[PDB]
Write a protein that binds this ligand. Structure first.
Ligand SMILES: *[C@@H]1O[C@H](CO)[C@@H](O[C@@H]2O[C@H](CO)[C@@H](O[C@@H]3O[C@H](CO)[C@@H](O)[C@H](O)[C@@H]3O)[C@H](O)[C@H]2NC(C)=O)[C@H](O)[C@H]1NC(C)=O
Lengths: 49, 49, 48
């Protein structure tokens, strides 16, 4: 489960409506909201023995 | 994405051969329909690390 | 005085069927550059 989700928009920074899939191990959630994003954002996971 | 609707078709298949693009035939079932409505021009993906 | 109802006055291009827009940037009605908030040929995107 390396890949998690997707984003959709026209400019993707705090000024246009944007769509977001994130698929966690639990129930997936879809949102359509305004958003601001980081330069290289992701959901870095950590191994737990 | 057509006239205020976002349609996603999905399929999960098992493969046990080379990483290259497989041959053979398989169809995609309709997964979900989203009634949102938005201009879309770009997209990007997210992965866990 | 009911002044809470607004709509759009100039737009770059026509919308699509069932498409929503909440833009608030000032429209450059003229070809001159428009910065900040207020100026000539660029005053306001919406009207009440
Ligand atoms: C959905 O979003 C896209 C992305 O912005 C919109 O395309 C944009 O359309 C405008 C209108 O023509 C383009 O503006 C043009 O800019 C050039 C300079 O680059 C200028 O010479 C023209 O006179 C005009 O002002 C803009 O470039 C274009 N964006 C692109 C191609 O990335 C599209 O119109 C939107 N759809 C709706 C229904 O609003």
């Amino acid at each position: 489960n390396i890949i998690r989700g997707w984003i959709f928009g026209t400019t993707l920074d705090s000024k246009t409506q944007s769509l977001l899939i994130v698929n966690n191990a639990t129930n997936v959630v879809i949102k359509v909201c305004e958003f601001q994003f980081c330069n290289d954002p992701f959901l870095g996971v950590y191994y737990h023995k | 994405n057509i006239d205020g609707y976002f349609k996603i078709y999905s399929k999960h298949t098992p493969i046990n051969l080379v990483r290259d693009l497989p041959q053979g035939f398989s169809a995609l079932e309709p997964l979900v329909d989203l009634p949102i409505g938005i201009n879309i021009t770009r997209f990007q993906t997210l992965l866990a690390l | 005085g009911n002044y809470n109802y607004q709509y759009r006055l100039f737009r770059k291009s026509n919308l699509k069927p069932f498409e929503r827009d909440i833009s608030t940037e000032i429209y450059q009605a003229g070809s001159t550059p428009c910065n900040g908030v207020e100026g000539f040929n660029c005053y306001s995107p919406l009207q009440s």
